[PDB]
Structure formats: structure tokens, C-alpha cells
Amino acid sequence: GQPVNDFIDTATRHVLMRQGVLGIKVKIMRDPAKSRTGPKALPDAVTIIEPKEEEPILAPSVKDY
Amino acid sequence: XXXXXXXXXXXXXXXXXXXXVLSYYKVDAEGKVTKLRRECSNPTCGAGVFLANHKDRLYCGKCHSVYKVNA
RNA sequence: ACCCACUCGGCACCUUACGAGAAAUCAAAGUCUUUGGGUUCUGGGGGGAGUAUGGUCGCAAGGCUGAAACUUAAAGGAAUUGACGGAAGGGCACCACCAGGAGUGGAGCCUGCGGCUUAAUUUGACUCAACACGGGGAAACUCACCAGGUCCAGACACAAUAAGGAUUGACAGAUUGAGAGCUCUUUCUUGAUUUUGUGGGUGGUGGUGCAUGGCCGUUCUUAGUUGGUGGAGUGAUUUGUCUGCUUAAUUGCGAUAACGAACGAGACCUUAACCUACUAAAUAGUGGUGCUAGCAUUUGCUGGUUAUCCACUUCUUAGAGGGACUAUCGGUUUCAAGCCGAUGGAAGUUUGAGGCAAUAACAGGUCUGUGAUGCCCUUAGACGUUCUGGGCCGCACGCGCGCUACACUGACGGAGCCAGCGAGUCUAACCUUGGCCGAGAGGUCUUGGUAAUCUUGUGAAACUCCGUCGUGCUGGGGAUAGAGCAUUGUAAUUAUUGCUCUUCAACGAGGAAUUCCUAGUAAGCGCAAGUCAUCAGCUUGCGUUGAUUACGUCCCUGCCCUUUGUACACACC
Numbered sequence: 030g031q032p033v034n035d036f037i038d039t040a041t042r043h044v045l046m047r048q049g050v051l052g053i054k055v056k057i058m059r060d061p062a063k064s065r066t067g068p069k070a071l072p073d074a075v076t077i078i079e080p081k082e083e084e085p086i087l088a089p090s091v092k093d094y
Numbered sequence: 095x096x097x098x099x100x101x102x103x104x105x106x107x108x109x110x111x112x113x114x115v116l117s118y119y120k121v122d123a124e125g126k127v128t129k130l131r132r133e134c135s136n137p138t139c140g141a142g143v144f145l146a147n148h149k150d151r152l153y154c155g156k157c158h159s160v161y162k163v164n165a
Numbered sequence: 166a167c168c169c170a171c172u173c174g175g176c177a178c179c180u181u182a183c184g185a186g187a188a189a190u191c192a193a194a195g196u197c198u199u200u201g202g203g204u205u206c207u208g209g210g211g212g213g214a215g216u217a218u219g220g221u222c223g224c225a226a227g228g229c230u231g232a233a234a235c236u237u238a239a240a241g242g243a244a245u246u247g248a249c250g251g252a253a254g255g256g257c258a259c260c261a262c263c264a265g266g267a268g269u270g271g272a273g274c275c276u277g278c279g280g281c282u283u284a285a286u287u288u289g290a291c292u293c294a295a296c297a298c299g300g301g302g303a304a305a306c307u308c309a310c311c312a313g314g315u316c317c318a319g320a321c322a323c324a325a326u327a328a329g330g331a332u333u334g335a336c337a338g339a340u341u342g343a344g345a346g347c348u349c350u351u352u353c354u355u356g357a358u359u360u361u362g363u364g365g366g367u368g369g370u371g372g373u374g375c376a377u378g379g380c381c382g383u384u385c386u387u388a389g390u391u392g393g394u395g396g397a398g399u400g401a402u403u404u405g406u407c408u409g410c411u412u413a414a415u416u417g418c419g420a421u422a423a424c425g426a427a428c429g430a431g432a433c434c435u436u437a438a439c440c441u442a443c444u445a446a447a448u449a450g451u452g453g454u455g456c457u458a459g460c461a462u463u464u465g466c467u468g469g470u471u472a473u474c475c476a477c478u479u480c481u482u483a484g485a486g487g488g489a490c491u492a493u494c495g496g497u498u499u500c501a502a503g504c505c506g507a508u509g510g511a512a513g514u515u516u517g518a519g520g521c522a523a524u525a526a527c528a529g530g531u532c533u534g535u536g537a538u539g540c541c542c543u544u545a546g547a548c549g550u551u552c553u554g555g556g557c558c559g560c561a562c563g564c565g566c567g568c569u570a571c572a573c574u575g576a577c578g579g580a581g582c583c584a585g586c587g588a589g590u591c592u593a594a595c596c597u598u599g600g601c602c603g604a605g606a607g608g609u610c611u612u613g614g615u616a617a618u619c620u621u622g623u624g625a626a627a628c629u630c631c632g633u634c635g636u637g638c639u640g641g642g643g644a645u646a647g648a649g650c651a652u653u654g655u656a657a658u659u660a661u662u663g664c665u666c667u668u669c670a671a672c673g674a675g676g677a678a679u680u681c682c683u684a685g686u687a688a689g690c691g692c693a694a695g696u697c698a699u700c701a702g703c704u705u706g707c708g709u710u711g712a713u714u715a716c717g718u719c720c721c722u723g724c725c726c727u728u729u730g731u732a733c734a735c736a737c738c
């Protein structure tokens with residue numbers, strides 16, 4: 030998919046030797062968190078903000094200013 | 095593949111012949127020098143270059159061929 | 166006779182496993198390096214071989230006893246994971262079938278393949294996954310093939326020749342297809358650039374895709390791959406990754422010695438749909454106004470006018486947003502994931518269609534895309550290259566993709582008259598409107614455009630309407646062939662293509678077979694783009710007209726999955 034275009038660089042290189050040639054194929058996948066100028070995460074990613082304990086009750090009452 | 099055939103007769107090349115040449119020019123009894131063979135009135139060939147003597151034919155070789163002066 | 170409890174001794178099963186084992190497994194195969202209850206028998210790597218020999222028993226066939234030489238690095242056991250089967254159980258799919266549509270298979274031609282022919286008819290590829298494929302529509306070129314002619318563009322090093330010239334070129338004639346000084350005659354020219362030899366290079370559409378890279382196709386219209394902590398196992402391993410249900414999906418639910426995750430699917434991206442909300446526009450358009458034509462006249466109706474001005478953004482353009490999450494409701498389901506129906510909605514089949522796409526495999530195709538490349542071959546009487554000419558088109562015939570037809574839901578003739586995706590000329594001749602001339606093809610003079618500006622509203626074709634014909638190989642059909650005219654091109658003969666007249670074939674719905682397809686789809690219909698000097702019956706996209714039939718299954722076929730067997734693991738070639 031699309032994240033491929035966004036996050037992985039590839040290169041093929043032909044390395045000519047005494048016997049024949051070999052194909053080097055390099056693939057690098059870069060930290061998307063660091064994206065900088067694009068999307069900062071995979072389309073996959075789904076973060077939930079973590080609530081907060083509450084200490085409720087305290088029967089009514091009102092503040093004045 | 096197939097290899098070879100030939101109803102024969104291979105073609106050769108050329109030679110530039112021999113000739114200890116430019117004897118042509120003649121100097122009299124000490125020491126006046128007269129040119130044999132006439133030279134070229136083309137601006138390109140400042141009259142050092144001569145004309146070969148055939149028949150009808152006098153011809154400038156320096157002009158790689160160029161021009162047909164006839165006397 | 167039957168039931169309950171007990172107990173000796175039987176044939177067995179069940180669950181455990183403290184314990185054993187290399188494991189499979191085992192209440193003995195336990196009580197074994199913490200090694201001793203009694204006793205009997207047999208084995209000491211594989212083959213050679215239960216062979217030779219002697220003894221013995223037998224009527225015999227044979228039985229018992231039973232060697233060595235020599236050969237050899239493994240043979241063997243159990244389990245694991247793969248791979249594979251002409252074993253079994255499940256699934257998925259219009260490259261499967263059901264219900265059907267439109268066909269192909271029959272005909273004419275077009276075009277590839279075989280075959281034959283040939284100087285040559287260059288060549289790759291042969292089930293799906295070779296054959297309108299190599300973007301492969303070849304007149305030269307391309308081009309590799311064939312008949313023949315030039316050239317070196319043979320780096321460099323050493324040696325040799327050699328300034329008394331190493332070498333170079335050529336006018337005319339001869340030659341030659343040729344205005345190739347190819348060679349020859351002849352005799353000027355040139356000046357250390359070459360020549361000759363060896364060494365070494367260099368080019369090659371020469372060989373090897375079974376030496377390679379890269380790319381691509383296929384498996385795959387598939388759903389699979391892995392690691393952390395836990396559990397099992399001495400171990401390779403396994404569980405997680407599973408009976409079921411569910412999904413297009415190892416997509417999920419659920420079950421659960423597993424829990425929680427990552428690659429792949431999904432997400433993501435592109436394009437088609439919806440925004441009287443946002444920002445705008447003489448390279449897009451609308452309303453008002455002026456200038457103005459025509460028809461009515463009573464306002465009116467229908468046009469002209471890239472700026473005569475004013476305002477707008479519904480339509481067009483493209484930025485930014487918004488929108489859908491199978492929403493609401495209800496059926497159904499283990500009331501789970503889901504599935505179904507109704508309403509709403511631009512939109513509810515993964516929204517439609519694509520792009521991307523893991524792990525692994527193949528001796529799939531490509532050395533003929535590459536100045537990617539190993540090795541082999543070849544290298545001046547070239548397999549380098551170029552030039553002239555022919556050839557890839559050759560035709561008893563087999564095969565594939567196609568085009569056009571057999572007519573009356575039609576052909577012909579008037580007339581109506583509507584798309585979308587494209588593309589176009591600088592140091593050049595591309596897209597072409599308009600005016601004339603021409604039956605046509607085309608010609609000619611001008612013209613706008615490097616483009617939302619001009620071609621172009623690309624006035625496309627099927628289609629619609631009024632006529633002619635009237636079922637007759639007919640006015641359906643347009644093969645084959647003759648004559649003439651033009652266009653591209655240096656060149657049109659074997660006829661590039663276009664036009665006119667004439668000639669008027671087979672084909673009366675196509676055997677056995679076989680392809681493709683579920684909605685703006687199928688089928689019909691044209692167009693633009695690729696190729697392109699010229700040539701589309703091909704492709705790639707595009708819009709126009711627009712259905713019948715399923716919404717299911719495992720019968721055929723194909724494939725994945727379990728279970729199972731394996732003496733395979735280079736893995737059933």
C-alpha cells in the first residue's frame with residue numbers, strides 16, 4: 030500500500046565480479062514517528078488517550094468571583 | 095554456423111609504388127635549375143605541387159584530384 | 166435365574182505415571198552408575214550369507230549344525246519438519262458449474278503459429294502460464310536472413326620497414342548495380358598521423374536464460390509468515406496458528422495451556438460519485454445593462470455583439486474542508502462476530518474501479534532493451550560496419566486471435582442530431598479552422614494554437630424521423646478482378662494508403678466441441694491515444710445506447726485446506 034511510498038526506500042545495484050554478477054537489493058524502513066513532512070504514523074495506528082482517575086462526590090456547593 | 099566457401103580469387107590492396115622520385119627538375123652546368131613538369135594555378139597549391147603527365151591529361155594530385163589543366 | 170458387597174484365580178480394557186525408555190510407548194519395558202533374588206537362551210557394524218565345507222536327519226523337497234577370503238562408512242531404530250500420492254473429509258471461484266446473454270467452432274477476408282516452398286523466406290516462445298505475444302502494423306531503414314560491393318572506427322606496448330620516403334589521396338579510362346581510385350592502367354600528390362609482425366585489445370541482434378544481474382510471468386480471483394512471556398518435549402519441535410461459526414480475508418466471534426503482538430489482509434493511496442457551505446475566475450460560465458437583427462406586436466419570443474459597463478459562482482475548473490460509520494428500526498443467528506429486510510441517504514456488493522502488496526517456489530520468459538554481465542565463439546576472404554538489391558508477405562494444406570456477414574428490430578436515401586478520455590510546430594513544419602477550385606480522393610490561398618485561449622461544442626457512430634425497396638443469394642453480402650485518378654515517400658512492381666466506375670464469390674444462423682460474462686455490467690456503437698513519412702481489421706483507454714438471467718451450489722473442472730502413508734528431502738522430472 031501507500032505507506033510503502035511514504036516509509037521505505039529501496040535500491041537495486043548490480044555488482045560485477047570475476048565470476049558473474051550479483052544483485053544487491055537494499056530496503057530501509059524509516060521511523061514514521063519522526064516523519065517530519067508527512068504522516069507521523071501508519072494508517073494502522075490507533076492511540077487511545079488515557080482518561081484520569083476521578084475523585085468525585087463533594088456534595089454540591091458553588092464558587093463566587 | 096556453416097563456415098567457408100570461395101569460387102576463389104582474394105582481393106589485394108595497393109602499394110604507393112616505389113620511386114626515388116623528385117629527380118624531376120634539372121640543373122645545368124653550375125648551377126642554374128630548371129623545373130620539368132608544370133605546376134598548379136590553384137590558390138590552395140602554391141606552385142610547389144606539380145601536374146602528372148598522362149595523355150590529354152595534365153593533373154593536380156595535391157588538389158586530391160581537383161582540376162583538369164590540359165596542354 | 167436375577168441384584169448388591171466381598172474374595173481367590175482368568176481373558177482383557179480404562180485413567181494415571183511416583184518410575185523407565187532413543188523415542189513410539191510400557192503395571193512392566195518399574196523397583197539400574199544409589200549398578201547383585203534364581204535360572205535358561207541369543208546378539209556384538211553392514212555386506213559376503215544362512216552362502217562354502219564337513220557331520221547328521223529325510224524317499225524327496227529339504228531340516229539341524231555352519232565358516233572364511235574379500236568388500237564396505239555406514240547400514241539400522243524412533244520421532245520431527247517438509248515435499249509428494251492413481252487414500253479419506255472438508256471448503257473456495259462465471260479464467261467452475263447452475264439460470265441465461267453474447268458468441269467463437271461452419272463462410273469471405275484480416276492477422277499470428279505450424280507446415281511446405283525458398284538464394285533467403287532472420288528469430289524467440291508451444292497446456293492454463295506459446296500463436297493481434299516480443300509493444301513484432303518489416304517497401305529503404307528497422308534487420309538479425311539471402312546475392313554481392315566498400316571501410317577499420319584493428320586502443321595501447323615492443324619489434325620491423327623507413328626521410329634517399331613509413332604512409333595518404335585522385336582526375337580520365339578500364340572496371341562496377343553505382344559519379345566506390347574496389348581493383349587495374351598512368352604518375353602526380355601526401356610526410357611519419359600510417360604500414361607489417363607478434364602481444365594485447367575492440368565490436369558483434371554470434372552461442373549459452375542450464376553460467377548470472379535486472380525486469381517480468383506463474384503459483385495467487387491466494388491467505389499466508391514470525392517473534393516475546395507462559396505450557397509440552399532430552400531433542401529437531403510443538404502449543405499460540407483450533408472442532409465450530411463467520412468473512413473477500415489467520416476477517417472476526419467463540420472454544421481454549423495459552424496471553425499479548427508484529428509482516429501480509431485490512432488500514433493507506435488514486436480515480437468515479439455528493440456539497441445553492443469556503444476561497445476565486447476575459448484561458449470556465451450565468452443573470453442585468455447598454456449596441457443591435459428577426460418575428461409579433463400589448464408586455465413578449467429567438468439570436469448577434471473575448472470587454473461597452475455592473476453584479477454573481479447554480480452549472481465548469483481545483484484548493485481547503487465536510488460526508489458514511491453497512492447509520493435508524495426490525496427480523497435472524499450460540500441472541501457472539503455476523504447475515505437479511507425496511508426507511509432514510511450522493512452514496513450502504515471491500516461504496517464502484519484500480520495502485521501498492523509478506524514468506525517461499527520455477528532450472529517459466531528475457532543475454533534480441535541496455536556501454537548490465539561470466540564463459541565460449543568470431544575479429545579483415547569479419548559473425549565489426551556500411552552501401553545496392555531481395556527476403557521476413559513466398560502457398561496443395563493443419564491450428565489460434567480477429568473483422569464483415571447471411572438481412573425487413575434491415576439495407577439504401579433524404580432529414581433529425583448528441584459524447585467522453587486524448588494530442589499537437591524551435592530553432593520547426595505538428596494540431597489545423599476559414600476562402601476558393603475539384604464528383605471524389607485531394608489541391609490552393611490564407612489563418613488561430615507551445616493551448617481550459619486555437620483545431621474543438623472534436624455537430625463520433627450506433628440512434629431518432631419521412632421516404633424507396635418487399636422477401637426474391639433481393640436493393641442482404643461485398644470476396645475476387647479490370648480500368649482511371651490522387652496522397653506519403655529518394656523509392657509504391659509482389660499492387661502502403663485514399664477515391665471513381667465496373668466485376669457481385671462464399672455465406673440461407675453454422676457438427677463434435679469451446680470462450681466470456683452479474684449492472685450503467687453484458688452486448689451493440691463509434692472516438693482519442695500508442696505504433697506512425699505513409700499504413701489498424703491490433704492494443705490501451707474513453708464516452709454513447711443499454712438488456713435477459715443467477716444472488717445459488719459442488720455436478721463438471723481448477724485450486725487451497727485438514728486427516729493419512731512414505732524407504733522421498735536434488736523432495737514423484
Ligand SMILES: [Mg+2]
Pocket residue numbers: 030
Ligand atoms: Mg492494502
Ligand SMILES: [Mg+2]
Pocket residue numbers: 115116117118
Ligand atoms: Mg615528381
Ligand SMILES: [Mg+2]
Pocket residue numbers: none
Ligand atoms: Mg510422558
Ligand SMILES: [Mg+2]
Pocket residue numbers: 182183184
Ligand atoms: Mg511409574
Ligand SMILES: [Mg+2]
Pocket residue numbers: none
Ligand atoms: Mg490394576
Ligand SMILES: [Mg+2]
Pocket residue numbers: none
Ligand atoms: Mg557382525
Ligand SMILES: [Mg+2]
Pocket residue numbers: 213216
Ligand atoms: Mg560368498
Ligand SMILES: [Mg+2]
Pocket residue numbers: 219
Ligand atoms: Mg555334507
Ligand SMILES: [Mg+2]
Pocket residue numbers: none
Ligand atoms: Mg545336508
Ligand SMILES: [Mg+2]
Pocket residue numbers: 224
Ligand atoms: Mg519313503
Ligand SMILES: [Mg+2]
Pocket residue numbers: none
Ligand atoms: Mg543355524
Ligand SMILES: [Mg+2]
Pocket residue numbers: none
Ligand atoms: Mg549346509
Ligand SMILES: [Mg+2]
Pocket residue numbers: none
Ligand atoms: Mg568386516
Ligand SMILES: [Mg+2]
Pocket residue numbers: none
Ligand atoms: Mg511424516
Ligand SMILES: [Mg+2]
Pocket residue numbers: none
Ligand atoms: Mg451454463
Ligand SMILES: [Mg+2]
Pocket residue numbers: none
Ligand atoms: Mg451455443
